[PDB]
CSV table of C-alpha atoms in Angstrom, one decimal:
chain,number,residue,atom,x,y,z
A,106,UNK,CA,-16.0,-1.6,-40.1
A,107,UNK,CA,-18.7,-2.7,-37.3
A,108,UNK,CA,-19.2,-5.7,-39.6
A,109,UNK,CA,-16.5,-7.4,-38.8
A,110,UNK,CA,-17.4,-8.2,-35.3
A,111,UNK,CA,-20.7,-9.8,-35.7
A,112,UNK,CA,-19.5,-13.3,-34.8
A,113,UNK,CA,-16.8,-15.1,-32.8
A,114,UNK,CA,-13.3,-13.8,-34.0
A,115,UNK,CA,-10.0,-15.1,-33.6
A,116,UNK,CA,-7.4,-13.3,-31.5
A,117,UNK,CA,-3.5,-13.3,-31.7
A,118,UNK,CA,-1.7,-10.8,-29.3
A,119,UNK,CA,2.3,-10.5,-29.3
A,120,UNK,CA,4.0,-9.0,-26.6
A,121,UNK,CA,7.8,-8.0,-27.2
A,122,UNK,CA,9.3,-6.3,-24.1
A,123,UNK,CA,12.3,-5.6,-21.8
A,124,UNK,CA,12.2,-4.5,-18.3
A,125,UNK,CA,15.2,-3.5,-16.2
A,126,UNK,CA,16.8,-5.4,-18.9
A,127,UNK,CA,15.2,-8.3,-18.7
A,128,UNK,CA,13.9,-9.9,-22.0
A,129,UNK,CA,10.5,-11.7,-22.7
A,130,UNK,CA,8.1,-12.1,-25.3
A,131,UNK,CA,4.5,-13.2,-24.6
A,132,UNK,CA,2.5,-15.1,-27.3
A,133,UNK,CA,-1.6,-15.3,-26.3
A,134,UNK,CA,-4.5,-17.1,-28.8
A,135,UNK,CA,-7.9,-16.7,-28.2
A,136,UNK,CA,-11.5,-15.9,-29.2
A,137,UNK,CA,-13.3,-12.5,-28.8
A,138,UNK,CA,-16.8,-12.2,-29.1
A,139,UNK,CA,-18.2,-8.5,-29.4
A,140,UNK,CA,-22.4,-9.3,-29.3
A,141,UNK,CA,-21.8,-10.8,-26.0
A,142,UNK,CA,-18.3,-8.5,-25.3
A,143,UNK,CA,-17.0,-11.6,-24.0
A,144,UNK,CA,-13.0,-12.2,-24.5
A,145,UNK,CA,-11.0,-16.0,-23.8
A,146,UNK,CA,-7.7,-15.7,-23.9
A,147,UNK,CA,-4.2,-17.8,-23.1
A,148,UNK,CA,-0.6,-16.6,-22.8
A,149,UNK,CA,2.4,-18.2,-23.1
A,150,UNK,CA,5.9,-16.4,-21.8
A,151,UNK,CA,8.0,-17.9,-24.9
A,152,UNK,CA,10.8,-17.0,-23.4
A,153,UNK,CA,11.1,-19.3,-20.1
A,154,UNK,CA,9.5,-17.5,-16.7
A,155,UNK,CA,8.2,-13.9,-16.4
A,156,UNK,CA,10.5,-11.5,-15.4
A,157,UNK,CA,7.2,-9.5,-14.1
A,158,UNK,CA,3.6,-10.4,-12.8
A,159,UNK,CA,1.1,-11.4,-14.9
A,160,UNK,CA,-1.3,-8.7,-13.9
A,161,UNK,CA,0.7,-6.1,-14.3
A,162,UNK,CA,0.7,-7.3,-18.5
A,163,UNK,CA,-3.2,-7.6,-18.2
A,164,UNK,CA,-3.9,-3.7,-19.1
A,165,UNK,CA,-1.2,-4.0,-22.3
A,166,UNK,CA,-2.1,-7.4,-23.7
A,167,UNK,CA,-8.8,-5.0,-28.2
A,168,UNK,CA,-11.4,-2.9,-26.3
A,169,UNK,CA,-13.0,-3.6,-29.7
A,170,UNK,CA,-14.9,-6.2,-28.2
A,171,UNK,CA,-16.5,-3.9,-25.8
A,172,UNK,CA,-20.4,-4.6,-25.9
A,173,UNK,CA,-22.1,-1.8,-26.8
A,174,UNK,CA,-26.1,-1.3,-25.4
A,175,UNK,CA,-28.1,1.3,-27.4
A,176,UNK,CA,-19.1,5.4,-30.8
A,177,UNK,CA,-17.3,2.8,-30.8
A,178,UNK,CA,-13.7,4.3,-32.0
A,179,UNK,CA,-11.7,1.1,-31.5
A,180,UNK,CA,-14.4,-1.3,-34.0
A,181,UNK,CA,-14.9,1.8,-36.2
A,182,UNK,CA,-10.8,2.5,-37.2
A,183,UNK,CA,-10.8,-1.6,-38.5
A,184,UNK,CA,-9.7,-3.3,-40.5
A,185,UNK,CA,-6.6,-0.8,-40.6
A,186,UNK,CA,-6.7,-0.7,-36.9
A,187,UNK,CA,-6.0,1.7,-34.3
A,188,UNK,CA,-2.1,2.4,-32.5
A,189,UNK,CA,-2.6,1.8,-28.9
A,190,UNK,CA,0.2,3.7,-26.7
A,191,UNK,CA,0.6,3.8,-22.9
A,192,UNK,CA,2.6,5.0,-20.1
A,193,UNK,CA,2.0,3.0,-16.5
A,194,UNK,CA,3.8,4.2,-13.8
A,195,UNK,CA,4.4,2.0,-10.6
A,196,UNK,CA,3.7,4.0,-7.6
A,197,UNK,CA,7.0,3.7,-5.5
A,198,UNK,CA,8.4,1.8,-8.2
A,199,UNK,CA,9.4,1.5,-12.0
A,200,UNK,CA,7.2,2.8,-15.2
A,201,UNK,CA,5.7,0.9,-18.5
A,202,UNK,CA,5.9,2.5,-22.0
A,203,UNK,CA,4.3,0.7,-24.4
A,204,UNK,CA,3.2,1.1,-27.9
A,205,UNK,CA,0.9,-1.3,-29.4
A,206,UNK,CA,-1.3,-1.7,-33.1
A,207,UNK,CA,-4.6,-3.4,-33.1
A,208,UNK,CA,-5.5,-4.6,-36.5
A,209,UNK,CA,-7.0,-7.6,-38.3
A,210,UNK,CA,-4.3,-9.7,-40.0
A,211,UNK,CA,-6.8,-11.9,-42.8
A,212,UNK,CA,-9.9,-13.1,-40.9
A,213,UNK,CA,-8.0,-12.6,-36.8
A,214,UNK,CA,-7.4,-9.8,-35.0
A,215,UNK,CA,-3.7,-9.1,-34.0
A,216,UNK,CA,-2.5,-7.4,-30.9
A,217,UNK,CA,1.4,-6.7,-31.5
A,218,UNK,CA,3.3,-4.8,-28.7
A,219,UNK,CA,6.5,-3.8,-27.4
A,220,UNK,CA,6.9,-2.8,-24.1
A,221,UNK,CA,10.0,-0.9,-22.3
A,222,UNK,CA,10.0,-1.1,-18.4
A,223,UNK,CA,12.5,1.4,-16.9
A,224,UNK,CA,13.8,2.2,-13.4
A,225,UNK,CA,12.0,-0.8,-11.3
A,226,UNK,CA,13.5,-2.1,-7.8
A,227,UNK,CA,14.7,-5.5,-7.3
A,228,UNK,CA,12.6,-6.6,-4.7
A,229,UNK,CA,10.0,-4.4,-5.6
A,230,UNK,CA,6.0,-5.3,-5.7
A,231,UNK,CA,7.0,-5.8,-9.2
A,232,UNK,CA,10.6,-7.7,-9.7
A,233,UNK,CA,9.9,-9.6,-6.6
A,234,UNK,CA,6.9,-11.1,-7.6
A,235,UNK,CA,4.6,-9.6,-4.7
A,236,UNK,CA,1.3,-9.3,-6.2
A,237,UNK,CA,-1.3,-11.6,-5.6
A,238,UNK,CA,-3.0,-13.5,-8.8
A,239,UNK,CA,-6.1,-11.6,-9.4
A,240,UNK,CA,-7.5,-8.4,-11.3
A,241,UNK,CA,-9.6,-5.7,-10.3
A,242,UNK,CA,-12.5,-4.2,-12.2
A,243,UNK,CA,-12.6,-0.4,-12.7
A,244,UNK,CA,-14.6,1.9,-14.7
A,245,UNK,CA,-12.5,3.8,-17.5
A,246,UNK,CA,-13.9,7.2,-18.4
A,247,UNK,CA,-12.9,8.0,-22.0
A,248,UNK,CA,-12.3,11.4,-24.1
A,249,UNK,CA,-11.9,12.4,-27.5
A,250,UNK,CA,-8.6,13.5,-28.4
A,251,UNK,CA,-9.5,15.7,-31.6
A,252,UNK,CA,-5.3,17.0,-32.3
A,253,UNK,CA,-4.4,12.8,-32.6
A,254,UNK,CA,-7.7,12.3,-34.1
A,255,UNK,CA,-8.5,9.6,-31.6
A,256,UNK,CA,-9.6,8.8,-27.8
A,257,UNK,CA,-7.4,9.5,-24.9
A,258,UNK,CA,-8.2,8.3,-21.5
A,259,UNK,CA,-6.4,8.3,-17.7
A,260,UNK,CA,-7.3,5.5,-15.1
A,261,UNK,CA,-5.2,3.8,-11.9
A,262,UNK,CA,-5.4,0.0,-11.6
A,263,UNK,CA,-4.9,-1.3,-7.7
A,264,UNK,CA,-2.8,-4.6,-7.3
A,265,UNK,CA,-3.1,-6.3,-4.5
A,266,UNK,CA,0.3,-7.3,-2.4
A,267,UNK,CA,0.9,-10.8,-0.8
A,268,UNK,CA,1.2,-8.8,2.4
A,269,UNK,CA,-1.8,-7.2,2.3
A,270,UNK,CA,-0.9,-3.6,0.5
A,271,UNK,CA,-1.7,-2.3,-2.2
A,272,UNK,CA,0.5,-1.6,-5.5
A,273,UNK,CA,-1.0,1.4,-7.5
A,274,UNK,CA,-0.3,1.3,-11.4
A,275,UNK,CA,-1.5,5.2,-13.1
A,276,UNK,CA,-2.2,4.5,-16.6
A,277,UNK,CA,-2.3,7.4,-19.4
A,278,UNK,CA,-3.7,6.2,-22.7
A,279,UNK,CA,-3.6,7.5,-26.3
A,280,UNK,CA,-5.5,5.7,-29.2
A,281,UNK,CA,-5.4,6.8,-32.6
A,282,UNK,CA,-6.4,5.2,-36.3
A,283,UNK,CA,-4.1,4.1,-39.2
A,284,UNK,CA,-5.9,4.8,-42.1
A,285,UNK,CA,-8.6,8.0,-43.0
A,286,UNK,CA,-10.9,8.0,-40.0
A,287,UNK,CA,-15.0,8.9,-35.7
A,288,UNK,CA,-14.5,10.3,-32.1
A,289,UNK,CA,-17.2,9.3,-29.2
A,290,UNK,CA,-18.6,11.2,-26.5
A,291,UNK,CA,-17.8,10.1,-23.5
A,292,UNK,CA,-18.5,7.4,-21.9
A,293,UNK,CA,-17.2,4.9,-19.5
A,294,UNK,CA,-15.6,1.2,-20.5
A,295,UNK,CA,-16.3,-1.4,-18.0
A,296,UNK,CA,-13.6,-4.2,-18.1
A,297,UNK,CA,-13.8,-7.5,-15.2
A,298,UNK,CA,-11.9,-10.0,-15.5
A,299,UNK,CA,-10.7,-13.5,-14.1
A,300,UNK,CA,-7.3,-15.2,-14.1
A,301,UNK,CA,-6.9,-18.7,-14.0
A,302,UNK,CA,-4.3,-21.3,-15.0
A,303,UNK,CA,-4.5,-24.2,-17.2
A,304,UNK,CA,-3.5,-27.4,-15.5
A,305,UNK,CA,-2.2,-29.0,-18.5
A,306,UNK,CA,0.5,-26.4,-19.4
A,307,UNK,CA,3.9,-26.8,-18.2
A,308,UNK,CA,5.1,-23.3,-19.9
A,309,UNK,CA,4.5,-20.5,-17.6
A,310,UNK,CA,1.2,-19.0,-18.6
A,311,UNK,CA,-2.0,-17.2,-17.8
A,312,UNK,CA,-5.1,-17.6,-18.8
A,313,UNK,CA,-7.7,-14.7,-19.0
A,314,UNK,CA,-11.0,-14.5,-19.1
A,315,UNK,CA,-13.0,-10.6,-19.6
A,316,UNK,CA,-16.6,-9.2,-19.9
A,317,UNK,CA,-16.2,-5.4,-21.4
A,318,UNK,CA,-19.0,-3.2,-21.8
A,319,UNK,CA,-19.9,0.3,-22.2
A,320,UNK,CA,-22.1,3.3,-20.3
A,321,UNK,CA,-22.6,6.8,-20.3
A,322,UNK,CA,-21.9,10.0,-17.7
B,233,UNK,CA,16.1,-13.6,34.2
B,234,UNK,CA,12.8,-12.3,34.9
B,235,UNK,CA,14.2,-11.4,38.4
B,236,UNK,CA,16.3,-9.4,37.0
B,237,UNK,CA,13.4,-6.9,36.4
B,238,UNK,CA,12.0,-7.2,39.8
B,239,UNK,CA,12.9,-3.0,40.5
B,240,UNK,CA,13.2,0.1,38.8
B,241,UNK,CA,16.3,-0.4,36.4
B,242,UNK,CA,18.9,1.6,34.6
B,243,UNK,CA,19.3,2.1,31.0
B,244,UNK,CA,21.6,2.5,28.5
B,245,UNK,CA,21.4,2.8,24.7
B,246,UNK,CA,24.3,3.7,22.1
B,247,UNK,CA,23.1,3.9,18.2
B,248,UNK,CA,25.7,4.1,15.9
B,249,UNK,CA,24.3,5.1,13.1
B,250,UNK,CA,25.4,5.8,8.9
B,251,UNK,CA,22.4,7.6,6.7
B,252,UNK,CA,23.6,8.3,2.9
B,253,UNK,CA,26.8,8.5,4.4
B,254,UNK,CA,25.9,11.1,7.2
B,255,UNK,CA,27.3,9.1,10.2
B,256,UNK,CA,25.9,9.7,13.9
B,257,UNK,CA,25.7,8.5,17.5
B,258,UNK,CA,23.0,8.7,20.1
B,259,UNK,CA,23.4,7.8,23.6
B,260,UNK,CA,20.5,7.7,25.8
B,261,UNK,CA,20.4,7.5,29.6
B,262,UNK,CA,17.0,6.2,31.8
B,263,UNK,CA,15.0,4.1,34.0
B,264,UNK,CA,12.8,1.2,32.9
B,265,UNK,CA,10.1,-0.3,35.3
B,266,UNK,CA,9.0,-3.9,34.4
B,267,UNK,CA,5.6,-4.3,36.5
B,268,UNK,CA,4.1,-1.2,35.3
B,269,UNK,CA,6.2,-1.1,32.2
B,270,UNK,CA,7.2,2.6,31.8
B,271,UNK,CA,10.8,3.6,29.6
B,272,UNK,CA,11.6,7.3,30.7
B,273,UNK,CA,15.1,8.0,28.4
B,274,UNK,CA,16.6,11.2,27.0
B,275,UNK,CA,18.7,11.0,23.9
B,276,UNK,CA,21.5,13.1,23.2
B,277,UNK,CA,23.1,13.2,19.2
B,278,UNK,CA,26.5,14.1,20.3
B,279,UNK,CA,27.8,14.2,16.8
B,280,UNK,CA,25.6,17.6,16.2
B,281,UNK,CA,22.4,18.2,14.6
B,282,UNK,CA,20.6,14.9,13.3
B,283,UNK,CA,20.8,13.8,9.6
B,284,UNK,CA,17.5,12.1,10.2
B,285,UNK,CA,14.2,13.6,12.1
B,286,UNK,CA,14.1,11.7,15.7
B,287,UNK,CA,10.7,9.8,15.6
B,288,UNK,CA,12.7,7.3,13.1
B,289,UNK,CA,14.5,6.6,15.4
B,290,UNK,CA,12.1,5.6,17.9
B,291,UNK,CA,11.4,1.9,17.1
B,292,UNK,CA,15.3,1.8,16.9
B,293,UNK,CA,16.2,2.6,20.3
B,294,UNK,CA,13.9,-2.3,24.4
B,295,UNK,CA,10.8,-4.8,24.5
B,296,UNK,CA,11.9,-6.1,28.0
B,297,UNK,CA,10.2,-3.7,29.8
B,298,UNK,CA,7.3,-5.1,28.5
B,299,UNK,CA,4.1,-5.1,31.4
B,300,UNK,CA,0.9,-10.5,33.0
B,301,UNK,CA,-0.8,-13.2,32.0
B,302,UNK,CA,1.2,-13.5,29.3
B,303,UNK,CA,4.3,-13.7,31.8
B,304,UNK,CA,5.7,-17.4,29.9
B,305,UNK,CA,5.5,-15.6,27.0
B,306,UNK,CA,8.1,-13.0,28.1
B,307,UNK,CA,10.9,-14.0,25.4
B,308,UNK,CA,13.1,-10.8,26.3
B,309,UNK,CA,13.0,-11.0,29.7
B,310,UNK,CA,14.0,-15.0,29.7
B,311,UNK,CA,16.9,-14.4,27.4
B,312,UNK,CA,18.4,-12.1,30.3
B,313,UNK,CA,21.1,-11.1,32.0
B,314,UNK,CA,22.8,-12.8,28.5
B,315,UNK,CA,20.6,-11.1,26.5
B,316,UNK,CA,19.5,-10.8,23.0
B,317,UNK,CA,19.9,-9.6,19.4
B,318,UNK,CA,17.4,-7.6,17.5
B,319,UNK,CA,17.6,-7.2,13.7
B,320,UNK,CA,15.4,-4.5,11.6
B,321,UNK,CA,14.6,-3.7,8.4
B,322,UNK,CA,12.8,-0.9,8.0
B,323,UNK,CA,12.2,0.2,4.4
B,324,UNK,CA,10.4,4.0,4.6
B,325,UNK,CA,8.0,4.4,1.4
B,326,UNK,CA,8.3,5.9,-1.7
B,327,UNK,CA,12.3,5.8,0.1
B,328,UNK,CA,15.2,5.1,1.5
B,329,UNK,CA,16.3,2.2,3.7
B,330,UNK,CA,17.1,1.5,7.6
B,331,UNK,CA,19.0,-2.0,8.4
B,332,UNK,CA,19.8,-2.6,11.3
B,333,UNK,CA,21.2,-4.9,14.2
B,334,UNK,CA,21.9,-4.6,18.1
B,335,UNK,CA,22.4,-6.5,21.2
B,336,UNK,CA,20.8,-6.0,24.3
B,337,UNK,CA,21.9,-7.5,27.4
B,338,UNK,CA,23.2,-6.7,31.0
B,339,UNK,CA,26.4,-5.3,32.1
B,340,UNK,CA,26.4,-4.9,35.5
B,341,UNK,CA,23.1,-3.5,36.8
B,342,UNK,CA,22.5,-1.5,33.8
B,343,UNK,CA,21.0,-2.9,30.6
B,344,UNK,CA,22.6,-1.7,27.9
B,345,UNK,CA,21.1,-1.6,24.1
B,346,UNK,CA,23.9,-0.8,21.3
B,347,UNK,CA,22.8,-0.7,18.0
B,348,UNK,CA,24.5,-0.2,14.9
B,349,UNK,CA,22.3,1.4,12.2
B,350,UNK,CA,23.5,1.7,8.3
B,351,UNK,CA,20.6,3.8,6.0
B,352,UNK,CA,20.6,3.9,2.5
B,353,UNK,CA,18.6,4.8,-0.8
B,354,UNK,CA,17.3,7.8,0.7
B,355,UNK,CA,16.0,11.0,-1.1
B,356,UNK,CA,17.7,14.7,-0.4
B,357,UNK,CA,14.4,16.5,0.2
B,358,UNK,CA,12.4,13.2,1.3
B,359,UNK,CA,10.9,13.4,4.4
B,360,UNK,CA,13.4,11.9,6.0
B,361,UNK,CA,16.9,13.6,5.2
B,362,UNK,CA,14.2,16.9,4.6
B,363,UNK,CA,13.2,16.9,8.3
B,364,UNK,CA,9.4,17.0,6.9
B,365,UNK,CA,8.2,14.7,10.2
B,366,UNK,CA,5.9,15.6,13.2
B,367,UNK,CA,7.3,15.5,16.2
B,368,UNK,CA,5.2,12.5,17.6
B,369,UNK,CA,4.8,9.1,17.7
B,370,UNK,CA,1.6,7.1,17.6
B,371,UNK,CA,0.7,4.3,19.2
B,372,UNK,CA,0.8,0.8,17.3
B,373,UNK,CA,-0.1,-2.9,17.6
B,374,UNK,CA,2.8,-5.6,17.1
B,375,UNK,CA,2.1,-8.8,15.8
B,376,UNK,CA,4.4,-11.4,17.4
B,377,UNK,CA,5.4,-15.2,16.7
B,378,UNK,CA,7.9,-17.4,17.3
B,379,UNK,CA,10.6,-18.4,15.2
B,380,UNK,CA,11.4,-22.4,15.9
B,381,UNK,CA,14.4,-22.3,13.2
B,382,UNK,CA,15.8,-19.0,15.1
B,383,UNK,CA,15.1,-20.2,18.6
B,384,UNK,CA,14.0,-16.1,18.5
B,385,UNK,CA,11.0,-14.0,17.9
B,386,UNK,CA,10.0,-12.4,14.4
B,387,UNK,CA,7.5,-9.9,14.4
B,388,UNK,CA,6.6,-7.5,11.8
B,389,UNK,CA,4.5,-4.3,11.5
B,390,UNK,CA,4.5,-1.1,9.9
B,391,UNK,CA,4.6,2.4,11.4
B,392,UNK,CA,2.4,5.9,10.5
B,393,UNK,CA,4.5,9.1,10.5
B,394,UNK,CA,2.6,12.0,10.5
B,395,UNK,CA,4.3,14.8,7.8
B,396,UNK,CA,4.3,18.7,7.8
B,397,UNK,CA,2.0,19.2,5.0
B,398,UNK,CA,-0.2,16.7,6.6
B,399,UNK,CA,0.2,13.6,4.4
B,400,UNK,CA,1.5,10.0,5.9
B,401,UNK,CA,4.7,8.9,5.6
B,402,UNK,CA,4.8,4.7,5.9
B,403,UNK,CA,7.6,2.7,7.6
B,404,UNK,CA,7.6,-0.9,7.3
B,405,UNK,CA,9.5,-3.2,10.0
B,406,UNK,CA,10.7,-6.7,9.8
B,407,UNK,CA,12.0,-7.8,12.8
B,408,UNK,CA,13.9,-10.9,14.2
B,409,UNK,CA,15.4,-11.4,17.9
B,410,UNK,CA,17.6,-14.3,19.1
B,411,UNK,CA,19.0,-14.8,22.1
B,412,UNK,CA,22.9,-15.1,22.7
B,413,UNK,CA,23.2,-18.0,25.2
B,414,UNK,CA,21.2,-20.8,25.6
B,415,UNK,CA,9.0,-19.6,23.2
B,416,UNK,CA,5.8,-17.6,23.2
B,417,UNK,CA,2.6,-18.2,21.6
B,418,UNK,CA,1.3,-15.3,19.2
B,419,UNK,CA,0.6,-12.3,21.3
B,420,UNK,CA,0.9,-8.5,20.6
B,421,UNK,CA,2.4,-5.1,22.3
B,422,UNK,CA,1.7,-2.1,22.7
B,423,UNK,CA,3.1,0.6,22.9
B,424,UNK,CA,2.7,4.5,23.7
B,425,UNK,CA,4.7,7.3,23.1
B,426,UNK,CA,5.4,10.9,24.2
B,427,UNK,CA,8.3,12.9,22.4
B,428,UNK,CA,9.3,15.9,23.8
B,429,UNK,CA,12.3,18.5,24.3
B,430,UNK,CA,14.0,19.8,27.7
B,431,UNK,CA,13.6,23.3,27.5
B,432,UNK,CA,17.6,23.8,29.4
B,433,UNK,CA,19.4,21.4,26.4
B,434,UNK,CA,21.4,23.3,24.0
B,435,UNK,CA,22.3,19.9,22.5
B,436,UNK,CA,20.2,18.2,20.1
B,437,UNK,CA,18.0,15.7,22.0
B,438,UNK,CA,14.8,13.6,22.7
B,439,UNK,CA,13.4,13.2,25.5
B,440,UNK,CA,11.1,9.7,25.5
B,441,UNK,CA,8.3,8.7,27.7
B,442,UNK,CA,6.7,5.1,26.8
B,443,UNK,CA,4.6,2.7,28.5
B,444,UNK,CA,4.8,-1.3,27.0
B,445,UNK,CA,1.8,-3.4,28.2
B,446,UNK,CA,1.4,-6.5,25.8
């Protein structure tokens, strides 16, 4: 299982979704490495421009490239892969549900998700577009979820707002395996990342770059 | 125009105003003093008891009476005895919705502010249409700027409203004023306010002291 991310592996994430009604499907390649935890990653909206901000889709679009020091749930459940399900609520505004599976597909690992956004404003922080191009790292505390036989975990993520506010996003998060599973203690998942655009790419896209890690208390 | 506001000067304010459909009217009688820049006013909701607590309606209900310096910069005052138009959108958080428009200007000796206020989108048992609001107002800064496009003033800022249980309740305001007949550099005012009741009015009421400095 561990084995499997000893080396630079290919990544292929699928995003399906439909907020307020509005269709899009996300397509991303890139490279993961788990020795150095280091992720590259570029998106493509397939389906002509994003209905939504592209750091709201950052938390939805493979903590199994985490860099563990000195538990690791989400290399340990491949190659079958884990199911990744999540319920974001917009503070003053709409709410994700998504369901994802995480699993290797021959030698790369696929991300394929379907996300459902209900009961956003137009003109909100959201569907107007408001939040400014960037993503803030937090800490993620983590917890073992013995009745799903996987880790559950609650964070917020703070998006900054063109005019200077801020646009809360509460995240509640359930993993669990696909096949015959080993829950971890708890610990704390450090994710930073960078956005950045390619200036060759006509399609609109993000490109992301991440560093994820791993401590204790 | 500017002369206009020489001496102490008499006010008059209408709101006409529809919340979720609740429809009300304020009128408010008072004196406004230029050079020091004090508003005394009482408001009156003649319709009955308010759908909405009163310190919403506080930013609603006069920048003219403004206090130096600055004196070019006095927009309001120049439009005068014409007058102006002030448009607002203030979107409460978490909530419902105030847009709204008026025209102040002179008639006669009086200046005379008459609004027309339409609010939607708001919650039953919010903290608006619940009455959860302090009685108060705080002071605040405005950012202002001029508008070349508008030949007016935009400003916006946003408003704290202290609440019952002792949270915040956050009201944001988008503002444009252009005159009606025929501009300053970036500057702010500031504005204090008192809220309080006459003890002898069986009527629903306010009772506003402010003083406008800039």
């Amino acid at each position: 299982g561990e084995e499997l991310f000893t080396g630079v592996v290919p990544i292929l994430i699928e995003l399906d979704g439909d907020v307020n009604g509005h269709k899009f499907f996300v397509r991303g390649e890139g490279e993961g490495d788990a020795t150095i935890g280091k992720l590259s990653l570029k998106f493509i909206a397939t389906t002509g421009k994003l209905p939504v901000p592209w750091p709201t889709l950052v938390t939805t679009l493979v903590q199994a490239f985490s860099r563990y020091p000195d538990h690791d749930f989400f290399k340990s459940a491949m190659p079958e892969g884990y199911v990744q399900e999540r319920t974001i609520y917009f503070k003053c505004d709409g709410t994700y549900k998504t369901r994802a599976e995480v699993k290797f597909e021959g030698d790369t690992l696929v991300n394929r998700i379907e996300l459902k956004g209900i009961d956003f404003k137009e003109d909100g922080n959201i569907l107007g577009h408001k939040l400014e191009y960037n993503f803030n790292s937090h800490k993620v505390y983590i917890t073992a979820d013995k009745q799903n036989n996987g880790i559950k975990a609650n964070f917020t993520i703070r998006h900054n707002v063109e005019d200077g506010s801020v646009q809360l996003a509460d995240h509640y998060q359930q993993n669990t395996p696909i096949g015959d599973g080993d829950l971890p203690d708890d610990h704390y998942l450090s994710t930073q990342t960078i956005l950045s655009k390619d200036l060759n790419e006509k399609r609109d896209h993000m490109v992301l770059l991440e560093y994820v890690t791993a401590a204790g208390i």
